Ligand binder design. Structure first.
Ligand SMILES: *[C@@H]1O[C@H](CO)[C@@H](O[C@@H]2O[C@H](CO)[C@@H](O)[C@H](O)[C@H]2NC(C)=O)[C@H](O)[C@H]1NC(C)=O
Ligand SMILES: C[C@H]1CN(C2CCN(c3cc(Cl)ccn3)CC2)[C@@H](Cc2ccc(Cl)cc2)CO1
Length: 362
């Protein structure tokens, strides 16, 4: 199995114990660590943060004592400008300048591959996305062709049925990608105005949600049916929760809300919490395992958060092993309890170690 784990470069700026640099990462935890994100500037791949070159080095030094560890650089992101990617991918000359810029940059900076994070191609970009992936892989084969270790090409793909149908030619891109990470979280399965879990494993109660699509199992089965080989499909597991402010005394799934949850102290983003912030939240909270969805929510006062814990990520690993998938993907290492100081067990990376342990289990 693969355990593909993201590190985000803006996590260095979080206050106090929230600050995360690559030298806090456990070199033996994951098989692949992906650094997010690189820019595209003047149609060339390029750095984003002022100190990316320093942080690239802190990450790649982890391979010194773990020669099996691979690193990739993820280009794009969700505040990149899909308009910007679209223009780069449709223009024949821009696309070639970008492809040609990628292997020198990865070799210069010590990376083993590129992860494409175009979030998200439009219906009008579906074929451009295929062409981009085909031509990028072709350049990687050419660059290695004299006995080099070939660079890896991965892509992070939406788990949302509407985006999958509009944006991706799954069967074609799967032939060229070394692996696909399906982003099986941030689902919006609840009726408008109500709570729901953003990463359920299955639909659960049939008469309680609008659609059958907003869950991990539907997305995985669908992408396999569309032609992604199981041996290339890496299943996303979040180390963050999505939260809501409750509008009444009701606290179950589908309870009325007035808006997103109160921001966490470190991540400062209403509607989201890192897992270590959730560990803090859990003191005084009530935890419920959602029947049929195989994941917990916690509620306290007027707050409600749907998240994954050690038990639920082991169930998700059992699921992916039953489906013979390639492994698990984790967003993100800096949202796990990487310090080991919040989740009361003294253990660093509690959620990602739980995933690692389940993948290794027999
Ligand atoms: C990422 O690259 C883009 C594209 O070059 C940069 O966007 C430019 O930024 C300058 C400085 O703010 C602006 O004056 C230009 O108008 C922008 N150009 C475009 C096409 O948007 C962006 O600054 C880069 N981001 C980084 C390095 O963090
Ligand atoms: C607007 C949504 C965006 N979503 C991202 C999750 C991560 N995902 C990727 C992207 C790639 Cl390339 C690869 C894997 N996953 C892209 C979407 C969450 C961000 C988040 C914010 C705050 C906190 Cl505390 C935790 C997570 C919640 O918000």
């Amino acid at each position: 199995y693969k355990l593909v784990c993201y590190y985000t470069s803006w996590s260095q700026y979080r206050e106090g114990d929230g600050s995360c640099f690559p030298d806090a990462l456990d070199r033996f935890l994951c098989t692949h660590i992906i650094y997010s994100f690189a820019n595209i500037s003047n149609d060339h791949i390029d750095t984003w943060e002022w100190n990316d070159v320093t942080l690239y080095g802190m990450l790649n030094t982890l391979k010194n004592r773990n020669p099996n560890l691979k690193t990739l650089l993820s280009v794009g992101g969700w505040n990149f400008g899909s308009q910007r990617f679209s223009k780069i991918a449709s223009n024949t000359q821009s696309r070639r300048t970008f492809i040609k810029s990628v292997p020198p940059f990865l070799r210069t900076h010590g990376f083993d591959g590129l992860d494409l994070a175009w979030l998200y191609p439009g219906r009008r970009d579906k074929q451009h996305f295929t062409t981009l992936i085909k031509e990028m892989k072709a350049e990687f084969i050419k660059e290695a062709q004299p006995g080099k270790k070939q660079l890896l090409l991965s892509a992070a793909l939406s788990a949302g049925k509407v985006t999958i149908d509009s944006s991706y030619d799954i069967a074609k891109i799967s032939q060229h990608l070394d692996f696909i990470s399906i982003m099986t979280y941030d689902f919006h399965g609840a009726w408008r105005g109500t709570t729901g879990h953003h990463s359920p494993l299955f639909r659960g109660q049939e008469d309680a949600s609008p659609d059958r699509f907003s869950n991990t199992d539907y997305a995985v089965g669908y992408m396999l049916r569309l032609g992604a080989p199981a041996s290339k499909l890496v299943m996303g597991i979040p180390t963050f929760g999505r939260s809501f402010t409750l509008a009444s005394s009701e606290t179950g799934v589908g309870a009325p809300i007035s808006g997103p949850g109160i921001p966490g102290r470190f991540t400062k983003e209403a509607g989201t919490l890192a897992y270590y912030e959730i560990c803090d939240f859990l003191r005084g909270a009530t935890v419920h395992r959602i029947l049929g969805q195989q994941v917990p929510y916690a509620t306290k006062g007027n707050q409600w958060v749907g998240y994954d814990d050690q038990e639920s990520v082991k169930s998700k690993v059992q699921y992916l092993k039953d489906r013979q998938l390639a492994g698990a993907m984790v967003w993100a290492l800096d949202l796990d309890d990487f310090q080991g100081s919040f989740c009361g067990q003294d253990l660093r990376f509690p959620l990602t170690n739980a995933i690692k342990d389940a993948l290794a289990a027999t």
